[PDB]
Design a protein around this ligand. Structure first.
Ligand SMILES: *C(=O)CCCC[C@@H]1SC[C@@H]2NC(=O)N[C@@H]21
Ligand SMILES: *C(=O)CCCC[C@@H]1SC[C@@H]2NC(=O)N[C@@H]21
Lengths: 80, 80
C-alpha cells in the first residue's frame, strides 16, 4: 500500500527526528523537501548519520517514532 | 499537501498509539482499516477515548508520536 519513494536506513541504530533532544523535527508530514535536505538521524554508539533526501517531493509519511531502533534497509520516510 | 481523509482529535489530551505501554500499535502506515477499527487513544486525566475509523481505507500517515499532547481538531491519522 505504501506507494512513493521510500528512504531507508543505511545502518543499524536508533532513529531520531530531531538534531537534539530539545529541537524541533527536521521534517513533518506534508512538508516539501529538496534533494540534500536532512530528514532524520540514525545513531549507533554516538556515530550519528544524517539521512538526506535523494529526491525532491512532499513527505507523505514517517514510519518510525523517535528513539526507536531501526535495521539496515528499514523504511523510514516516504516521499511523494 | 496532506490529501486524504483526516481523522482528528475529538479532545484535548495525550495521544497514544497503543492499548498499553507494552502493547503493539493499533495501526501502522500501510495497514488497511475498516469502519469501527481503533486507530489510537487520546487521554486526559485518565479519561481514555478510543478513536475509531469512520471510513474504510489504507493508513497513509500518522501525524503525531505517542506521548505527545494534542489539541481539539488536531490531525492525527490520514486514511486513503
Ligand atoms: C548519547 O547517547 C546522548 C544523547 C544523544 C542525543 C542525540 S542529538 C541528535 C539526536 N536527536 C535527539 O533527540 N537525540 C539524538
Ligand atoms: C496514567 O497516567 C498511567 C499510564 C496510562 C497508560 C495508558 S494505557 C493506554 C495508553 N497507551 C499507552 O501506551 N499508555 C496509555
Amino acid at each position: 500500500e505504501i506507494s512513493g519513494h521510500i528512504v531507508r536506513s543505511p545502518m543499524v541504530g536508533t532513529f531520531y527526528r530531531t538534531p537534539s533532544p530539545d529541537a524541533k523535527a527536521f521534517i513533518e508530514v506534508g512538508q516539501k523537501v529538496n534533494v540534500g535536505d536532512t530528514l532524520c538521524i540514525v545513531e549507533a554508539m554516538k556515530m550519528m548519520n544524517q539521512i538526506e533526501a535523494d529526491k525532491s517531493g512532499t513527505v507523505k509519511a514517517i514510519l518510525v517514532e523517535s528513539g526507536q531502533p531501526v535495521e539496515f534497509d528499514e523504511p523510514l520516510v516516504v516521499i511523494e
